[PDB]
């Protein structure tokens, strides 16, 4: 039975987490994204100038082309990418998926053009939302699932320290106490779960649903929740330069917690201080608006506090505080 551990590393300020992936022999640094189901990489089909500062896949060397197949995706922050498709061998922490679909980029928007931290994305959402046409493909995880000792993956993202992606097994030394599981609704292809209530500092409110997303930097919530949080932070103000609410870096921030199937998942105020807003004496808040999309995004800020198990049986998500 297979299992493996892939180590991830945060970029500056924990903006993204990258992990090495070997495709047809070439190792690329990819961003693992539980909010999407496409495995796409920078490739030799891009203009030479866009290949700059990246490790690129050369499909011709080892890939098998799926003639006539295309892919095209748009993300939550305005970024998009499109290309063609090949199958190849994809290895992550010693687990190899043979015949995995690899989405080679032919076009990428400026956001990706400018980010030299990653060489593409490895999607870990449910395969129902893979964008390949005319026939969608399975994610790396769906591809190898049946060969793993357990059909699950778990993640420990950390603040400015290496973390891990555990494939096929649970590492009990990564958390304190026991895991608490909650059911997942994968009808929209996400690892979606329900929270029973939340507590923002001194104020508690009704529950809502959200997705566990390693590919989102912040904790994105409903504007009402964001207001209630920042109403308790002296001097908090929005700064479009920074990207949302900013405050004096020395501010004492309230904790944020959600109650999930009886378990209280707490994000300590120190983790809500994302970092220097990169403009004067302020820091960006780790809690920001979800722009009225109707569900919350439990991004890295939230994940840095927990060890999370993504279990295909259920499906369900288990949570415990990181050790």
């Amino acid at each position: 039975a297979a299992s493996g551990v892939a180590t991830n590393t945060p970029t500056a300020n924990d903006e993204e987490y990258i992990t090495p992936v070997t495709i047809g022999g070439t190792t690329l640094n990819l961003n693992f994204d539980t909010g999407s189901a496409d495995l796409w990489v920078f490739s030799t089909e891009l203009p030479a100038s866009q290949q700059s500062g990246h490790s690129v896949y050369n499909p011709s060397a080892t890939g098998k082309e799926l003639s006539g197949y295309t892919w095209s995706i748009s993300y939550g922050d305005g970024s998009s990418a499109s290309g063609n498709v090949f199958t190849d061998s994809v290895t992550v922490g010693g687990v190899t998926a043979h015949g995995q679909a690899v989405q080679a980029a032919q076009q990428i928007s400026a956001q990706f053009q400018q980010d030299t931290n990653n060489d593409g994305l490895l999607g870990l959402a449910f395969s129902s939302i893979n964008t390949v046409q005319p026939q969608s493909q399975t994610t790396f995880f769906d591809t190898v699932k049946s060969s793993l000792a357990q059909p699950l993956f778990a993640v420990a993202l950390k603040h400015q320290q290496p973390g891990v992606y555990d494939f096929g097994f649970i590492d009990s030394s990564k958390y304190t106490g026991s895991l608490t599981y909650t059911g997942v609704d994968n009808s929209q292809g996400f690892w979606s779960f329900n929270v029973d209530s939340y507590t923002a500092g001194s104020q508690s409110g009704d529950g809502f649903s959200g997705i566990a997303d390693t590919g989102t930097t912040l904790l994105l919530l409903d504007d009402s929740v964001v207001s209630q949080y920042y109403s308790q932070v002296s001097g908090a103000q929005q700064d479009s330069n920074a990207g949302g609410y900013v405050f004096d870096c020395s501010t004492n921030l309230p904790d944020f917690s959600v109650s999930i199937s009886g378990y209280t998942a707490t994000v300590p105020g120190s983790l809500i201080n994302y970092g220097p807003s990169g403009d004067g004496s302020t820091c960006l808040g780790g809690i920001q608006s979800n722009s009225g999309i109707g569900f919350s995004i439990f991004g890295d800020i939230f994940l840095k506090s927990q060890y999370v198990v993504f279990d295909s049986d259920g499906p369900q998500l288990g949570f415990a505080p990181q050790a």
Binding site: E16, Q111, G215, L220, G243, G299
Partner: peptide, 4 residues
């Protein structure tokens, strides 16, 4: 930051 980003929103995947």
């Amino acid at each position: 930051x980003v929103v995947x």
